[PDB]
Ligand SMILES: *[C@@H]1O[C@H](CO)[C@@H](O[C@@H]2O[C@H](CO)[C@@H](O)[C@H](O)[C@H]2NC(C)=O)[C@H](O)[C@H]1NC(C)=O
């Protein structure tokens with residue numbers, strides 16, 4: 001009903017990264033103090049319905065539609081990064097598992113198979129932009145200091161699921177214990193302390209930064225990441241994550257993809273310096 005709404009993220013200083021990295025290769029360390037000016041973040045990932053409004057307005061054809069394929073996780077079927085990633089002809093945001101799938105029953109789920117360029121196009125059409133990695137991580141942390149997750153350090157506080165990830169033995173069995181085998185609606189699960197939904201889990205989220213693993217401990221202000229690179233940074237993990245193989249549903253976690261990449265577990269949310277017209 002208000003799936004394009006934004007929340008005000010307060011100005012502050014926070015610790016980005018961690019001096020106890022869990023995936024050292026990803027440049028989770030070192031911890032560094034970062035100052036972030038107040039800004040606005042979408043409460044929800046961009047949903048199928050919201051992305052359809054954009055396509056209806058602009059006629060935009062996504063990169064996956066133009067290339068004719070996109071990566072799909074083998075477990076959702078009726079150069080790949082792992083054996084469970086398949087390039088599927090005709091998989092795209094409207095057909096998230098391939099040409100015989102549909103989004104008609106999942107309008108409120110995050111849009112998938114959107115590349116970094118597709119995400120920038122949507123956000124700019126919406127009067128917004130992608131968040132930087134630092135803005136994203138600050139927002140994810142939800143006003144808590146040096147915690148694993150938006151809500152704290154326990155995966156299931158009070159015996160409750162707080163995010164949509166994998167349960168069971170990946171990749172053969174997803175039990176769906178948390179209520180969702182694939183994505184959940186963009187407004188599922190509790191919000192974090194800033195009012196954001198599914199900031200970890202559900203779908204990965206593009207950020208504006210180029211990827212590097214080499215970070216300084218210097219204190220910075222509104223950092224934008226390195227000036228060049230080959231891959232853009234994505235954050236937050238997805239419905240596929242599990243501690244056993246891909247422990248990336250932590251705010252400090254991070255991964256990357258080339259900007260023309262797309263996949264069945266990768267979406268985005270927008271940010272803005274000020275509210276767009278309303
Ligand atoms: C995107 O555009 C399509 C096409 O106009 C919308 O689907 C139509 O919606 C009208 C009512 O507004 C229906 O009476 C038509 O029968 C629909 N046509 C088709 C071919 O499906 C669609 O709702 C729009 N999506 C969003 C999110 O606004």
Ligand SMILES: [Ca+2]
Nearest residue numbers: 164165178180
């Ligand atoms: Ca799940």
Ligand SMILES: [Ca+2]
Nearest residue numbers: 198199203236
């Ligand atoms: Ca997420």
Ligand SMILES: [Cu+]
Nearest residue numbers: 237241246248
């Ligand atoms: Cu993961």
